Design a protein around this ligand. Structure first.
Ligand SMILES: [Zn+2]
Ligand SMILES: [Zn+2]
Lengths: 705, 748
C-alpha cells in the first residue's frame, strides 16, 4: 500500500503506477514524483559492513539490489537501471534462496563504505552580544548544556559580535585572547587570511576535550555588548559581518569538511554588510507589503549579500543554523537561503528563555540508539533511473551538483533542476526531499529508480543509503493508474511546488490544476454540477487544496516576512504526515462521555462541555469550553471522586505530549479557553469549504479552452 | 561622639654694569670657571619694586634675557650685533616637591584691563592706593578690595601678597579659567613587541621598569588612568577590570577602530592588582615572536582614539623602525653634501600631520627608540617635537650589555615618575616696545604669542626671540611669561614670571650686560633650526658668523685705540666664554663637518634644541676632572664634593693620570697608559663622584660610563679624544687657531 512502501523505503509517490508516456503524465496534472526520507529510521535497518557492488555498465554507477536479474549458473546479475549483465563478484558466486547477500533481502539498505581520514565535526558558535542580560544569560546556559551533548573530539569555534566581531582564540593559555574585526567591512578571504596568519587558521578550532574548562569559563563570563545606544536607536549589530568572517575562516582551513555555523541573534543586522534595518528606531522593519511594493529599501542588497554567503557555505559544504531570540524580526527572510541551501536549522522564537528555543536547540543534538548524533553531514544524493524515466528536479534543503555524467536529466525542471544529483551540508532523519520525474516515453512494463545517498555518519564513518523502487507503466486510461493515486502524497508535493514557486497566481495555479485533475478523474455529467463524484481515493485532494491555499505559508496575510520564511523552511523539510498537518491542521474534541474524536475545522465544534486540541504543527492549542473551563477554573480535577473530570483535562495533554515527542522544532503550546485572549488563534482558523466544493463542481463539469 | 564644638573646646582647654676689557688671545687656557658664573646683574633700583628683596625680580633660574640692559631702540640693538631672546624654564625640577614657587590660593587674579598683564612687583600704586599703573601698558586700573581684605585694618596688607613680593609665583586659578574640569593624568604605553624588541631584551626591561615603578608614576588626585598597547604587525589592546584580563588582537591597520568601549584606559589605583598581573604576562605572551613588522602609524592613531577623549600622553617604546602601516619608513641613503635635505628632513609626512591632530585633543608623544639599527630619529622626532614630548635615543641597545639596561631602565623610570601639566598654554607679554617674534622649543605654535603644551614636562627649556620695536621711551622695560595650566592633581593654576630690565642708549652698557650663556643658547637654537630645515653648513656658517660679527663690532665700535698691548683680540669679560662656546658648537655631534649617523646627528640636534641651559653648556664644552691630583676634601660633603674642571684640551692629560670627561651624555674615564699600579685603587671617591654626575633631580639622563687607557681601544680613544673641543680635532681647527683665524678675518 501507500504506508507500506513508506514504512519500508521512506518513499511516497504521487502516482504509484506511472503513465506510459509523457502526454499521459501531463494529462494527470499532478507530476510523477515522490517524497523521500533517505536517513529515515527503521527499527530493523540492514547495514552492510562493506562496500556496494556497483554496475560495470559504462556511465551507470547503480548499485546491486533486489530488482536485479540474478543468474546463478552464469553467476552474473543484470542491472535494472542501465540494463547490462555484470560479473557477479567472487564472494557472491554461491547465491541460494538461503544464502542471499544482504543487499538482496531489502529494497533499502545502508553500507558502511570507507572511513573519512579527516577532521571531526566542527561547531562554530556565532553569538550576538547585543541582547538583554536575562536573554543572553539563558542562552549562555543552553550553549553550555549543549557542549556536554557533543562528541568529546568535536572542534569548537567561537565568535561574539555586536559593534565589532570577535573571533576567539582558545589555543592561548597565557591569557585568553581574540582577534577583532570591523563589523562595518566586508573582509575578503585573502585579506582575512593574511591578518589571521600558532600562525595557522586551524587554531580557532579546537577539540572540546582539550578546551572544555576554558570555553566553559569563557561562556559563563559573557556579558551584553557595552557600546552606547543613542536617543531612539537600535544597537549596532553586524551579523552580516560575523557570518562573512565565520564562513571565510572555515573556507580558509576546512573547505569541504563538515562544519556547522550556529548563529544566535537577538535582533536584525543594523550594520552593513547584511543590513536589515537602520539603527534609528523611526525606520520600521519591512513587511510583506513593503517587500511586494518595492518599498523595502534594504531588502534587495541584503538578500543579495546573504545569498553570496549561502552559495559559499553550500559550495564549501558548510552548514548555517540560525536561532532568533527576540520579538522583532532579525531578517530570516533575507538570510533564509543560508539555511535552505545547506541542511541548516532556522528557528524563530521570542527569546532564548522560551521552551521553544531551549528544547529545540538541545533537540538538535539528539542521539541515536548507538549513542551517536542523529544529524548527518556532507550528504550527496544521486537518483538513477531506467531509460523510460527522467528527473525534473528536487525541492528541499539541498544544492545542485553540476558537471555530473548523469544522462537521466530532464529538459524540463521543477525546483532545483538541471541535475539528478544534489548535496546537503547537513541532513537528518527529519529531512525529506521532493524528487520530480518525467516519463521519457513519447507485457508488463516496469520503471526503476534508485536513490543513492552517500554521507558522513556521526559515528565517523562514511555510509551509503540505497533505496530502489519499481513502478509499473500502463497505457492511457488503465484503471490501475487512477487507483495508484496517493492523494496525501500529491497534495504535499503540490504544496512543495507551490512554496517553490512562491519563493521564486500560485493559488491560480493550484485552482487550475485541481480543476484539471477533477475533470479527468471525477465522474459526472457535463453541465450537471450535482452529479460530481470523486473516488474515495481522490475525495480528499480538493479539501487539501482548499486548506493549502489559505495556509500559513501560501497566504501570508497575517504573517511577518520572517514567520513566512520560518514556516516555509520547515515545510520544505518535513515528511508527508507532518506536512499534511501543516496544510490541514487537526482538531480533536474531548468530553466526559466520549472518546477523543476528529471534528470539522469550524465553529460548529466549539462547545461549552468539550475540550479542543488544534495541531498546526507550529502550534498545539488546547481550548477548554466555558463549562469545563469553569469546572477546571476551580477544583473538581483535584477531587478524588472527580477523577473522570481530571482524566478529561489530561487527555488533550497526553495526546499533546505524544505529538511533541520527536517533533522538531517544538511547536508553541497554548492553553486557552472561551474568553481567553489567545482563543483567537483557534477561531482565526475556523469562502467555506462548502462554497469551495460547490464552485469547484460547477467548473469541473464545464468545458475550458 | 564629639561635635565640632566639643573638639574646639577640648583643644582650647644708577649702578649700570661696566665694561671690563680682555684680550681673548691672552685669555688662553680659557678661564673655564666662568662657565659657572652668574650673568651680569639686572640693575633695578629698590624704588621700582613695591617690596624690594631678592625675589622681586625674576631669577636667572626661571628666565634669562640675553641682554640685561636692553637697547633703548632698534637701531642700537641692530648695531650691537647682539641677539635679544629669553631663555625660559617654567619648572626647575622633575618633581613639584622640590622648590615650588610661592602659591596663591586666594583665588584673586588682578589683571590690567587693557594689556591683560598680571599684577606684579613693578606696578605703581596711585591715588591713595585706590589704583595701580600697569608697568606694561601704563593704564590706570582699580585696586580690588580683596587685595586689602587680608589684614582688614592694616593698609600694608597688600605688600604681603605673593604677586607683589615675588617676580615668580603661582596662583590657584578662579573658576572662569576652566571650561572642562581639569584632566586626570592619562598614560598610554605603546610598546614594540616585534622580533628585534624581543632579542634586544628591550621589552622585558620596559615591562620590568614599569612594573617596579608603578609607585613612581604620579597619582596625586588618585585619578591617574593608564593604557597599554603592544604592537607588531598588529595592535594588541587589553581589557583591564577593576580589582578578567583579555587581549584584543586587531590586524586591520586601515582605519583606527577600537575593540570595546571601556576598561582599556583604567584607574591606576582601582586596577593596579590586575595591571600588575597583565604586566607579568606580556613578556610571556610574546616570549617568542617571529614577526618583524612594527605598525607604529596605525598604533599611534588607535592610541589617539584611545586617549584622545580626555587627552594625555602616548609614551612609545620601540626597537624597530616603523615597518607596516601608515607611516612606514625605510633605511636612508648614507653623507655630507645635502645630508639635511635627505637624512634629517622628515620622510613620511604622517608624522607632522599627526602632531597637528594631537593639538586638537591635547595629546603629547614621547619616544624611547632603543636599538642597534636605523630608527630614523630624524623623522620620528617630529612627534615629540611638536607635542611638547621628547625623543630619547639609545644607540646599540641589547641585553648583551648589563649597562644598556641600567641606562634605559633608569631614564625610562625617571621619565614616567616626572610630573607634568595638561592643557597648558604658555604666553609672554612685553612692555611697550618689546615684542615676541619667534618661539623655539618643543611645543605647538603657529599663532604668535602663544605656545600650546598638550602637556608640560619638567626637563626642558624654551627660547623666545624678542624684537625691540622702534624705541622704548622708558628707562625700564618688562617681560611677563604666563602659563595657564592643569596640574596633575586636578588643579587649574597660573604660573607667572615677570622680568624687569634697564634700558640704555649706551652700546658699552649693552655689551657689559650680555648673558653669554643665554646668547650661546640663542645661537644654538638658531643653528638647530637651520640644521634641520636648511643646510647643515648654513648652520655651521651661522655659528661662526655670530662670533665674527661680534668680535668685529666690539673692535670697531667699542675699542678705543690700536695702541693696546700686542695685536690682541678685543672683547669684554662677560662674553669671554662666547667665542669658545660657539667654536665648540661647530665641533659638536649635531654640527660636525664629516660623517655622522643620520640618527646620532638627529638625536644630537634634538638634544641641544631642548636641553635646559645648565646642561646645554656641559654638552657643548664638557666638564673634565683630573682625579689623580684631585683634592682630598672631595669624596663627601649629603652631596658629594666635586673637583675643579680643567680645560678640554688633550694637553692637560698627563701620560700617567686619571681623568673623567663629562659631556652631559656619556662619561669617560681615561687612565694614562703609564700610571702607578695604584690603578688597583679612594675607590669610594671615584665611585662617589660618578654617582654624583649621574643622579640629577631636574632631568632624566643616565650617564653611561666609558673606560679607556689595538682597534677597540683606538676607537674609544679617538672618541674620548673628540670630546676635548679645544684641540685640533675632526680636522677642525683648534681654539687658538680659531681666534687666530677670526682676528685675521675682522682685521682690515
Ligand atoms: Zn547499470
Ligand atoms: Zn596694561
Amino acid at each position: 500500500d501507500f504506508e507500506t512502501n513508506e514504512d519500508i523505503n521512506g518513499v511516497r509517490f504521487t502516482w504509484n503506477v506511472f503513465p506510459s508516456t509523457r502526454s499521459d503524465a501531463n494529462s494527470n496534472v499532478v507530476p510523477v514524483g515522490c517524497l523521500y526520507t533517505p536517513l529515515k529510521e527503521y527499527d530493523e535497518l540492514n547495514v552492510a559492513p562493506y562496500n556496494p557492488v556497483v554496475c560495470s555498465g559504462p556511465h551507470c554507477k547503480s548499485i546491486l539490489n533486489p530488482y536485479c536479474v540474478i543468474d546463478p549458473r552464469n553467476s552474473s546479475w543484470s542491472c535494472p537501471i542501465c540494463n547490462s549483465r555484470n560479473h557477479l563478484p567472487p564472494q557472491y558466486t554461491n547465491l541460494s534462496q538461503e544464502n542471499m547477500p544482504l543487499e538482496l533481502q531489502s529494497t533499502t539498505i545502508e553500507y558502511i563504505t570507507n572511513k573519512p581520514v579527516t577532521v571531526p565535526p566542527i561547531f562554530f558558535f556565532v553569538v550576538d552580544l547585543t541582547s538583554e542580560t536575562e536573554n543572553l544569560d539563558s542562552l549562555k546556559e543552553s550553549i553550555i548544556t549543549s557542549l556536554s551533548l557533543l562528541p568529546p573530539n568535536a572542534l569548537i569555534g567561537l565568535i561574539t559580535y555586536g559593534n565589532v566581531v570577535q573571533l576567539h582564540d582558545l589555543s592561548s593559555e597565557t591569557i585568553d585572547r581574540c582577534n577583532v574585526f570591523r563589523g562595518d567591512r566586508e573582509y575578503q578571504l585573502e585579506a582575512l587570511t593574511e591578518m589571521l596568519t600558532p600562525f595557522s587558521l586551524n587554531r580557532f578550532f579546537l577539540p572540546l576535550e582539550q578546551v572544555e574548562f576554558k570555553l566553559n569559563q569563557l561562556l559563563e563570563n559573557l556579558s551584553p555588548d557595552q557600546w552606547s545606544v543613542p536617543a531612539g536607536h537600535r544597537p549596532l549589530r553586524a551579523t552580516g559581518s560575523a557570518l562573512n568572517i565565520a564562513s571565510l575562516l572555515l573556507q580558509g582551513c576546512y573547505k569541504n569538511i563538515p562544519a556547522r555555523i550556529i548563529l544566535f541573534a537577538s535582533g536584525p543586522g543594523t550594520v552593513a554588510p547584511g543590513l536589515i534595518v537602520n539603527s534609528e528606531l523611526k525606520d520600521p522593519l519591512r513587511s510583506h507589503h513593503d517587500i511586494d511594493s518595492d518599498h523595502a529599501q534594504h531588502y534587495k542588497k541584503a538578500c543579495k549579500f546573504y545569498n553570496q554567503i549561502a552559495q559559499r557555505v553550500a559550495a564549501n559544504g558548510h552548514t548555517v543554523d540560525i536561532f532568533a531570540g527576540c520579538y522583532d524580526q532579525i531578517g530570516m527572510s533575507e538570510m533564509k537561503q543560508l539555511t535552505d541551501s545547506t541542511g541548516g536549522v532556522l528557528l524563530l522564537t521570542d527569546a532564548f528563555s522560551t521552551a521553544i528555543f531551549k528544547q529545540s536547540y538541545l533537540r538538535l543534538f539528539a542521539k541515536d540508539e548507538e549513542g551517536y548524533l542523529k544529524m548527518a553531514f556532507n550528504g550527496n544524493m544521486a537518483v538513477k533511473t531506467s531509460k523510460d524515466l527522467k528527473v525534473q528536479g528536487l525541492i528541499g534543503h539541498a544544492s545542485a551538483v553540476k558537471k555530473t555524467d548523469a544522462n537521466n536529466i530532464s529538459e524540463s525542471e521543477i525546483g532545483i533542476g538541471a541535475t539528478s544529483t544534489w548535496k546537503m551540508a547537513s541532513l537528518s532523519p527529519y529531512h525529506s526531499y521532493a524528487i520530480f520525474f518525467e516519463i521519457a516515453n513519447t507485457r508488463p512494463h516496469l520503471a526503476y529508480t534508485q536513490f543513492i545517498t552517500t554521507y558522513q555518519h556521526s559515528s565517523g564513518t562514511n555510509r551509503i543509503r540505497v533505496t530502489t523502487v519499481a513502478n509499473q507503466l500502463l497505457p492511457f486510461g488503465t484503471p490501475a493508474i487512477a487507483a495508484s493515486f496517493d492523494q496525501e502524497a500529491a497534495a504535499v508535493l503540490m504544496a512543495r511546488i507551490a512554496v517553490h514557486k512562491a519563493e521564486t497566481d500560485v493559488i491560480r495555479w493550484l485552482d487550475r490544476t485541481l480543476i484539471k485533475l477533477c475533470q479527468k478523474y471525477a465522474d459526472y455529467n457535463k453541465d450537471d454540477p450535482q452529479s460530481f463524484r470523486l473516488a474515495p481515493n481522490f475525495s480528499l485532494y480538493p479539501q487539501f487544496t482548499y486548506y493549502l491555499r489559505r495556509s500559513q505559508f501560501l497566504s501570508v496575510f497575517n504573517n511577518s516576512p520572517d514567520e513566512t520564511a520560518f514556516y516555509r523552511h520547515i515545510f520544505t523539510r518535513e515528511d508527508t504526515t507532518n506536512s499534511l498537518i501543516m496544510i490541514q491542521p487537526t482538531l480533536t474534541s474531548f468530553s466526559m462521555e466520549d472518546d477523543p474524536q476528529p471534528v470539522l475545522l469550524d465553529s460548529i465544534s466549539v462547545k461549552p462541555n468539550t475540550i479542543l486540541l488544534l495541531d498546526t504543527f507550529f502550534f498545539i492549542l488546547i481550548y477548554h469550553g466555558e463549562q469545563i473551563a469553569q469546572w477546571r477554573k476551580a477544583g473538581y480535577q483535584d477531587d478524588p471522586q472527580y477523577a473522570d473530570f481530571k482524566a478529561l483535562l489530561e487527555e488533550p495533554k497526553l495526546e499533546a505530549a505524544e505529538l511533541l515527542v520527536d517533533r522538531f522544532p517544538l511547536p508553541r503550546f497554548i492553553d486557552t479557553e472561551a474568553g481567553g485572549s489567545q482563543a483567537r488563534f483557534l477561531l482565526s482558523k475556523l469562502v467555506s469549504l462548502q462554497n469551495f466544493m460547490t464552485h469547484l463542481q460547477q467548473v469541473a463539469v464545464s468545458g475550458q479552452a | 561622639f564629639l561635635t565640632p564644638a566639643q573638639e574646639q573646646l577640648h583643644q582650647q582647654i644708577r649702578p649700570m654694569n661696566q665694561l671690563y676689557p680682555i684680550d681673548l688671545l691672552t685669555e688662553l687656557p680659557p678661564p673655564i670657571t666662568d662657565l659657572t658664573l652668574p650673568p651680569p646683574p639686572l640693575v633695578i633700583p629698590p624704588e621700582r619694586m613695591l617690596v624690594p628683596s631678592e625675589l622681586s625680580n625674576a631669577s636667572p633660574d626661571y628666565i634669562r634675557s640675553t641682554l640685561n640692559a636692553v637697547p633703548k631702540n632698534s637701531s642700537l640693538l641692530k648695531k650691537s650685533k647682539l641677539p635679544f631672546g629669553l631663555v625660559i624654564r617654567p619648572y626647575q625640577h622633575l618633581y613639584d616637591d622640590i622648590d615650588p614657587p610661592p602659591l596663591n590660593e586666594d583665588g584673586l587674579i588682578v589683571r590690567c584691563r587693557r594689556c591683560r598683564s598680571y599684577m606684579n612687583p613693578f606696578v605703581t600704586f596711585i591715588e591713595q592706593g585706590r589704583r595701580w599703573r600697569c608697568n606694561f601698558c601704563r593704564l590706570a586700573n582699580d585696586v580690588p578690595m580683596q587685595m586689602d581684605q587680608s589684614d582688614p585694618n592694616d593698609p600694608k596688607s597688600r605688600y604681603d601678597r605673593n604677586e607683589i613680593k615675588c617676580a615668580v609665583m603661582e596662583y590657584m586659578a578662579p573658576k572662569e579659567y576652566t571650561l572642562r574640569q581639569p584632566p586626570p593624568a592619562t598614560y598610554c604605553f605603546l610598546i614594540d613587541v616585534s622580533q628585534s624588541s624581543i632579542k634586544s631584551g628591550l621589552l622585558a626591561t620596559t615591562i620590568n621598569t614599569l612594573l617596579q615603578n608603578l609607585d613612581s608614576i604620579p597619582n596625586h588626585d588618585e585619578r591617574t588612568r593608564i593604557s597599554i598597547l603592544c604592537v607588531d604587525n598588529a595592535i594588541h589592546y587589553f581589557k583591564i577590570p577593576l580589582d578578567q584580563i583579555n587581549m584584543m588582537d586587531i590586524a586591520d591597520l586601515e582605519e583606527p577602530f577600537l575593540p570595546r568601549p571601556n576598561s582599556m584606559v583604567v584607574s591606576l589605583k582601582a586596577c593596579r592588582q590586575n595591571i600588575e598581573t597583565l604586566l607579568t604576562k606580556i613578556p610571556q605572551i610574546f616570549q617568542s615572536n617571529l614577526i618583524t613588522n612594527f605598525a607604529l602609524g596605525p598604533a599611534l592613531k588607535s592610541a589617539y582614539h584611545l586617549i584622545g577623549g580626555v587627552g594625555g600622553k602616548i609614551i612609545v617604546v620601540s626597537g624597530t623602525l616603523p615597518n607596516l602601516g601608515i607611516g612606514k619608513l625605510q633605511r636612508r641613503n648614507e653623507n655630507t653634501s645635502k645630508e639635511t635635505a635627505q637624512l634629517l628632513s622628515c620622510q613620511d609626512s604622517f608624522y607632522k600631520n599627526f602632531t597637528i591632530d594631537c593639538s586638537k585633543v591635547q595629546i603629547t608623544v614621547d619616544l624611547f627608540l632603543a636599538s642597534e639599527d636605523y630608527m630614523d630619529v630624524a623623522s620620528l622626532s617630529n612627534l615629540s617635537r611638536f607635542t611638547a614630548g621628547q625623543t630619547h635615543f639609545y644607540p646599540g641597545f641589547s641585553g648583551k650589555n648589563p649597562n644598556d639596561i641600567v641606562k634605559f631602565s633608569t631614564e625610562f623610570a625617571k621619565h614616567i615618575s616626572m610630573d607634568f601639566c595638561m592643557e597648558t598654554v604658555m604666553r609672554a607679554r612685553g612692555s611697550t616696545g618689546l615684542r615676541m617674534s619667534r618661539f623655539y622649543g618643543h611645543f605647538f605654535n603657529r599663532s604668535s604669542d602663544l605656545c600650546a603644551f598638550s602637556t608640560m614636562p619638567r626637563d626642558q627649556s624654551y627660547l623666545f626671540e624678542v624684537n625691540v620695536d622702534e624705541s622704548i621711551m622708558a628707562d625700564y622695560c618688562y617681560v611677563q611669561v604666563a602659563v595657564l595650566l592643569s596640574l596633575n592633581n586636578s588643579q587649574r593654576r597660573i604660573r607667572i614670571i615677570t622680568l624687569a630690565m634697564p634700558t640704555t642708549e649706551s652700546l658699552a652698557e649693552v655689551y657689559a650686560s650680555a648673558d653669554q650663556l643665554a646668547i650661546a643658547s640663542f645661537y644654538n637654537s638658531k643653528a638647530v633650526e637651520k640644521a634641520l630645515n636648511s643646510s647643515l653648513d648654513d648652520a655651521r656658517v651661522l655659528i661662526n658668523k655670530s662670533v665674527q660679527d661680534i668680535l668685529a663690532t666690539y673692535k670697531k665700535e667699542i675699542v678705543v685705540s690700536n695702541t693696546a698691548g700686542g695685536a690682541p683680540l678685543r672683547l669684554c669679560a662677560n662674553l669671554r666664554m662666547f667665542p669658545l662656546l660657539m667654536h665648540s658648537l661647530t665641533k659638536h655631534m649635531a654640527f660636525r663637518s664629516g660623517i655622522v649617523p643620520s640618527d646620532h646627528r638627529a638625536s644630537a640636534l634634538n638634544n641641544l634644541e631642548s636641553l635646559p641651559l645648565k646642561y646645554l653648556i656641559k654638552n657643548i664644552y664638557p666638564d673634565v676632572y683630573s682625579l689623580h691630583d684631585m683634592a682630598d676634601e672631595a669624596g663627601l660633603p649629603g652631596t658629594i664634593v666635586l673637583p675643579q674642571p680643567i680645560n678640554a684640551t688633550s694637553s692637560l692629560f698627563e701620560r700617567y693620570g686619571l681623568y673623567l670627561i663629562d659631556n652631559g651624555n656619556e662619561l669617560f674615564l681615561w687612565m694614562g697608559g703609564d700610571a702607578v699600579p695604584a690603578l688597583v685603587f679612594f675607590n669610594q671617591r671615584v665611585r662617589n663622584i660618578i654617582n654624583q654626575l649621574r643622579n640629577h633631580d631636574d632631568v632624566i639622563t643616565y650617564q653611561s660610563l666609558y673606560i679607556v687607557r689595538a682597534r677597540e681601544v683606538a676607537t674609544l680613544r679617538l672618541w674620548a679624544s673628540s670630546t676635548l673641543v679645544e684641540d685640533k680635532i675632526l680636522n677642525n681647527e683648534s681654539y687658538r687657531e680659531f681666534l687666530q683665524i677670526m682676528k685675521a678675518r675682522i682685521s682690515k
